[PDB]
Amino acid sequence: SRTIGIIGAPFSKGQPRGGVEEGPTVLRKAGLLEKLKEQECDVKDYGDLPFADIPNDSPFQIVKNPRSVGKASEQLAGKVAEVKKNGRISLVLGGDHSLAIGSISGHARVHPDLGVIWVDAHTDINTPLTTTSGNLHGQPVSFLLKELKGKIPDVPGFSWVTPCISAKDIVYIGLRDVDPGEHYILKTLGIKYFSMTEVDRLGIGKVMEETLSYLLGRKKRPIHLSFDVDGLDPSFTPATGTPVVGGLTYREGLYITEEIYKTGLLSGLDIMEVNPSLGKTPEEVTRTVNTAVAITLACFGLAREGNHKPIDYL
Amino acid sequence: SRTIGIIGAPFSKGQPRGGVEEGPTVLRKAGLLEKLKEQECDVKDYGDLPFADIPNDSPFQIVKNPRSVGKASEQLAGKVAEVKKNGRISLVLGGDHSLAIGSISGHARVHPDLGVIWVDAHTDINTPLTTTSGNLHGQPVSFLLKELKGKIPDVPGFSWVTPCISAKDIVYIGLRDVDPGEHYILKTLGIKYFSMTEVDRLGIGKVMEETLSYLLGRKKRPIHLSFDVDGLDPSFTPATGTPVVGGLTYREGLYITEEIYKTGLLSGLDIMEVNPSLGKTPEEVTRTVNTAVAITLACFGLAREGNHKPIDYL
Amino acid sequence: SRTIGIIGAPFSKGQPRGGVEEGPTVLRKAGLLEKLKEQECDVKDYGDLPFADIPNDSPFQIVKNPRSVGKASEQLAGKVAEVKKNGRISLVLGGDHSLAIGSISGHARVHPDLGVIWVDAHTDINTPLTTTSGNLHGQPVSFLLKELKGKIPDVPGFSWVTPCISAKDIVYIGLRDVDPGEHYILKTLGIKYFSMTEVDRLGIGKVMEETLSYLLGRKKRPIHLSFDVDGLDPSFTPATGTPVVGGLTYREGLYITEEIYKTGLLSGLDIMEVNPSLGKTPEEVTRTVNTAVAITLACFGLAREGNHKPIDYL
Ligand SMILES: N[C@@](CCCO)(CCCC[B-](O)(O)O)C(=O)O
Ligand SMILES: N[C@@](CCCO)(CCCC[B-](O)(O)O)C(=O)O
Ligand SMILES: N[C@@](CCCO)(CCCC[B-](O)(O)O)C(=O)O
Ligand SMILES: [Mn+2]
Ligand SMILES: [Mn+2]
Ligand SMILES: [Mn+2]
Ligand SMILES: [Mn+2]
Ligand SMILES: [Mn+2]
Ligand SMILES: [Mn+2]
Numbered sequence A, B, C: 001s002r003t004i005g006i007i008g009a010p011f012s013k014g015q016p017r018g019g020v021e022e023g024p025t026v027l028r029k030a031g032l033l034e035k036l037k038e039q040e041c042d043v044k045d046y047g048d049l050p051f052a053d054i055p056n057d058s059p060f061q062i063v064k065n066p067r068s069v070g071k072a073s074e075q076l077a078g079k080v081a082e083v084k085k086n087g088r089i090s091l092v093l094g095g096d097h098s099l100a101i102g103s104i105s106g107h108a109r110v111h112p113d114l115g116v117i118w119v120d121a122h123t124d125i126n127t128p129l130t131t132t133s134g135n136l137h138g139q140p141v142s143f144l145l146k147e148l149k150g151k152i153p154d155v156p157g158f159s160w161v162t163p164c165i166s167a168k169d170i171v172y173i174g175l176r177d178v179d180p181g182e183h184y185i186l187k188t189l190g191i192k193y194f195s196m197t198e199v200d201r202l203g204i205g206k207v208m209e210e211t212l213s214y215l216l217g218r219k220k221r222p223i224h225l226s227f228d229v230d231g232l233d234p235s236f237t238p239a240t241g242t243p244v245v246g247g248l249t250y251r252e253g254l255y256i257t258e259e260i261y262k263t264g265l266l267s268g269l270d271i272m273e274v275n276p277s278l279g280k281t282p283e284e285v286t287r288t289v290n291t292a293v294a295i296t297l298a299c300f301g302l303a304r305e306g307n308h309k310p311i312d313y314l
Helices: A018-029 A032-038 A066-085 A097-110 A140-144 A180-189 A196-202 A204-216 A250-263 A282-299 B018-029 B032-038 B066-085 B097-110 B140-144 B180-189 B196-202 B204-216 B250-263 B282-299 C018-029 C032-038 C066-085 C097-110 C140-144 C180-189 C196-202 C204-216 C250-263 C282-299
Strands: A003-008 A042-048 A089-093 A115-119 A170-173 A192-194 A223-228 A266-272 B003-008 B042-048 B089-093 B115-119 B170-173 B192-194 B223-228 B266-272 C003-008 C042-048 C089-093 C115-119 C170-173 C192-194 C223-228 C266-272
Touching (some): A018 A032, A018 A266, A032 A042, A066 A097, A089 A097, A097 A223, A115 A204, A192 A196, A250 A266, A266 A282, B003 B032, B003 B066, B032 B282, B097 B140, B097 B266, B192 B204, B250 B282, B250 C196, C032 C282, C196 C204
Parallel strands (some): A003 A042
């Protein structure tokens, strides 16, 4: 049995729009913890992390809010590793995607052999030097990869970081808005990816088979799934900062997570970029939070074919 | 050539919302019979069944409107078998899904070797004892299966029933909202199913190939298709009682029926759960009835690649 | 490197609704030429063709505006062949689909071995004799096919025409609204097609593999892609004359064009039937023009996985 540790990460400074810091509140109020308990699940809430304001935080070159972003990830890393040490699956509710730096980092402290599956419209792999936006939620993978050590300058707020994953340890699913520099890195390091082009080519069934085979063929290992909700089409998750049309369907989102759940190796989870303030209507907000919740429940056992307890129902 | 017998079943007491009893009217007014005649088809309307009110109908334990539901199915069974005896494909317009008890029962009187394909978001396989809702449109399969004889109590209105199909004789397509007890039965009896998980895994092309192979591999036999319109995503069929997101597409709905039509073994058809009263707008109603009509026309020969008469057009 | 020649064809008389003549303006104002230059592309605008009014143009039997349609295609053919002779990929912005007669004709003057891929909800293969609508945008393929020489009467405005393609040289993708006579021709001449039925059966990945194999297996040859925007579902391209539900997705549209681009044999392109006047709202217009632009950019190299210049980004 899956045991769970819920971590709230109400943080927005990895990008411009503020509303994403509310993601944990709105997911919680949607009944997340309750529905989890409704299923197989033993849930422990570690609360929402308290991130002190860092009011003196001028850009580093063009990188924005570097100390605030870096400290928020540091604090998160500590709480993830703690949850992992407590033998629980970590569930991080964001919060912008810059927090993956901390989530993946703390996870890797307890499980250095983790493999990452990254569900997203973006590769989030810009370095502080290749970024044009300066937004750190567009940079988390660059900091985590060993191969890029040599390419990440010393950014204030980030000296605690030590890249914990190799290019071989991550698979992207969903890409459809990749910066040229990101694409250069992607191709140079030979990272496994399934852009929407591949999903279209192969079908989500084969995508997940290749993804799981690629990460677990050699050896079973813990899986960290970093789910940016903008990975799904904005018709399912509109309330988000950087939506891109041509996204994954609701069905595909549920199939990805259904398949991961079934490995029995889900070890860390991030549910990121829900910005309720960005819904053009109250129904767009509910649709977004509802989808986010459903993705999460699938990650912990809720299957479309149904579920039952080990009793005789007749 | 396909010959057709249309049966109206304006009945709602298998579930709480009343508007589904209008389904036959709105489908008819959408031009159903006319469009059928527009294609290959010889159509005979047997009219809308007249279901006397049964005003004394208190719950049986928690099962609601049992006599009304049971009598409505009894009457329907008689009219189906009659249509079948007239050598026609039976086309039942519902009406809530509890009527499948009668539709499948009467069909099986003339063709005891029928195989059932059930298109639906639900398994509709609760027994009177496993149901939590007490709604009979959630129970029709339990009554029909031989394997569950021993598990169905004596419910008033249902003593005429004799289970006519085995677990091996039905394939479900579309499942995404299955009760635990239903899932227990599903797994215990080893019923062939393709939940939305399987459709996602395999693609609808392989789903229909396995479905038709599984039912007809051994021997050709008549096919009964029980189509709950909530099997399709509510973006195509919103005007319905129990909608569930992540449904089959319009395209998939048409591919399922296109493929069935092409077997030349369609023998019975149910078009169920259209509730025009449940459309939030008049366009949602039209979209629902339009989809329902299109599914039906495909079932009787209308193909997306086109159709032509056996003449030289040039 | 792809070099491009843009040809505006503001013409509507192949069908009843006038607004399609604006397609070139609205596509241009959406930044088409600029975004092309933003990518690999050397762009030359040949301007919008000026089509003199032909005010005396009574039906030929039931065929409408025959001289106007025929002259507009004649003029277009001249400008395509000119662009082709300048060693550029021709990009025709329509304009109704009747213009394909000229686009394909002029293209074939410089490249008689062209193969055609036709993305559309319709086969547009009615002859002047099989048509029931009399609308010429429903007839362009009949005029182009050698096999139908003998079946096309002498229609005023069309004596300059000489059928340049054989039945073997065209593949249709998307069909879902085919007239009986069209279906007769389709089946009689043995034309390669993937209706929505095939796309559903096979998945777009296999559709494009079979399409490209079928056209290029024997020999590499230039490709002409005639893209009717009604080929995509009206949820992506609503602002159009003859929309049909159950269309290709946005994703499929981009996968088709991504795959064609990658052959490096795209030689001619038509982007047809955008009617901004037919959007029920200003957002429906933008959605339509946006989709049209995106399809086009994919045709000239813009890939979902990303793109980068041949430099070292790190
Ligand atoms: N790549 C972007 C856009 C670049 C524009 O030139 C977007 C990053 C999105 C971050 B996410 O967490 O949402 O995926 C960036 O800001 O780095
Ligand atoms: N399984 C349901 C819900 C159970 C809630 O605990 C739904 C049945 C739907 C019947 B249908 O004909 O629409 O598929 C039931 O009422 O039995
Ligand atoms: N086949 C149609 C409808 C026939 C009705 O009987 C439609 C032609 C559409 C032309 B398009 O360029 O849009 O695909 C025709 O006008 O020929
Ligand atoms: Mn993203
Ligand atoms: Mn992201
Ligand atoms: Mn149902
Ligand atoms: Mn049902
Ligand atoms: Mn068309
Ligand atoms: Mn067309």
